[PDB]
């Protein structure tokens, strides 16, 4: 099961395309909102092509299913109340996809790509625990939901790896900063040839979208920062 | 038909055993349970409308007579958190969920608080009791505790971060909003 875009940022009035392909032999799809506060609202259901079922939805939230069982929902006239991650499923049992994020805002002078640092391990830490962790710092960024994973010699690391649930307010009264630590053996991190890099996926505006102002177009990107093992 | 979840927090130590609740208002010919993992992805656990499931050490019962259904995790571990829905049934009903998290058993506890370059302080190795509290001062910025395991050392730890760009800001007064431990080693 499958979605595009992962995310989308948009503006009052504007129109969003969500698109789904379910799980190959499925016919039925659904389409579920999850906004921060609810939980899960059923908003659509289509089989064989059709619609079968809405929930609490206006007529400018519409779709359709095609002659494959893929599907696409078109939400018009957005609204701010429209933000919410909306879901996919397939098929008895319900598969679901990875959901599309949906955020409607007044305008995109707030879209900021984060910065990212790492910092090493302390030298202290090292003597007294024989391990190192590295930190790595996601800063200045609106909006959130970023996806911040860790690469070590090319490849992507889960074991040793500790990341903040919820960004932090830079001004709690406004733009996010995010955390996450990686934790080796010191033996790892003083052999030189080791590569560490945390990365940064930040969602923001894409072609579509109209930027004016003087910085740079704030596009999704992948803003990443590096570390060597010791020289 | 009302979804009815419990409960609606779960704190538990690893190696704990626990059990969700879901009750319905009505009949129904399908119940799932699912977890949502941190970037918004739904993982089917069970489908399960009525009898018992096993799938390693999560386990499911739905006594469909009597309109209920009990997620069991037996030796919960920090890789269990997160969100737990349970939903009845051509569309789902969800429940609002079971928040679960699972901290460490930190029998080797080392509280110490270090400086990083390339600033930044971390505040590691303290036990799952320890609460990491935010700063007062909105240009100081600290993290929540969270769980690291460094699988092939079968070894977990906790770790909160801060930093500033304060003069003033410095490790040794960084986490002082917080009850520290008294041995903390600060290098
Ligand atoms: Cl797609
Ligand atoms: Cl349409
Ligand atoms: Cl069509
Ligand atoms: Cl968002
Ligand atoms: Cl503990
Ligand atoms: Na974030």
């Known amino acids: 099961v499958t979605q595009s875009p992962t995310h989308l940022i948009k503006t009052r009035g504007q129109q969003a395309t969500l698109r789904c392909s379910p799980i190959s032999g499925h016919t039925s799809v659904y389409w579920y909102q999850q906004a921060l506060g609810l939980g899960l609202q059923f908003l659509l259901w289509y089989d064989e092509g059709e619609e079968r079922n809405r929930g609490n939805f206006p007529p400018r939230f519409s779709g359709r299913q095609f002659p494959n069982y893929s599907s696409e929902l078109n939400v018009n006239a957005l609204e701010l109340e429209d933000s919410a991650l909306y879901l996919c499923?397939?098929?008895?049992?319900?598969?679901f996809g990875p959901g599309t994020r949906l955020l409607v805002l007044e305008d995109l002078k707030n879209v900021f790509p984060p910065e990212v640092a790492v910092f090493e391990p302390s030298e202290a830490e090292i003597s007294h625990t024989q391990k190192a962790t590295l930190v790595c710092l996601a800063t200045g960024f609106y909006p959130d939901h970023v996806e911040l994973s860790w690469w070590v010699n090319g490849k992507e690391v889960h074991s040793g790896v500790c990341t903040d649930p919820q960004p932090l307010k830079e001004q709690p009264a406004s733009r996010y900063a995010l955390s996450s630590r990686l934790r080796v053996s010191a033996t790892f991190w003083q052999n030189p040839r080791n590569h560490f890099r945390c990365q940064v996926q930040f969602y923001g505006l894409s072609e579509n979208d109209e930027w004016t102002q003087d910085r740079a177009k704030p596009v999704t990107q992948i803003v990443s920062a590096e570390a060597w093992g010791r020289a | 038909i009302q979804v009815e979840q419990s409960p609606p927090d779960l704190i538990l130590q690893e190696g704990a055993n626990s059990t969700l609740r879901c009750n319905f208002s009505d009949s129904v010919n399908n119940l799932q349970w699912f977890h949502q993992n941190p970037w918004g992805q739904l993982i089917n656990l069970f489908y399960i409308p009525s009898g018992t499931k096993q799938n390693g050490r999560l386990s499911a019962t739905t006594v469909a007579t009597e309109r209920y259904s009990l997620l069991y995790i037996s030796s919960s571990q920090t890789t269990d958190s997160g969100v737990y829905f349970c939903a009845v049934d051509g569309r789902l009903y969800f429940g609002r969920g079971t928040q679960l998290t699972v901290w460490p058993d930190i029998q080797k506890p080392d509280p110490a608080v270090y400086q990083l370059r390339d600033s930044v302080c971390l505040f590691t190795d303290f036990d799952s009791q320890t609460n990491v509290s935010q700063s007062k001062d909105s240009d100081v910025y600290i993290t929540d505790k969270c769980v690291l395991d460094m699988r092939s050392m079968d070894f977990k730890s906790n770790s909160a971060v801060a930093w500033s760009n304060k003069s003033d800001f410095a490790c040794a007064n960084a986490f002082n909003n917080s009850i520290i431990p008294e041995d903390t080693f600060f290098p």
């Open positions: 499923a397939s098929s008895e049992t319900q598969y």
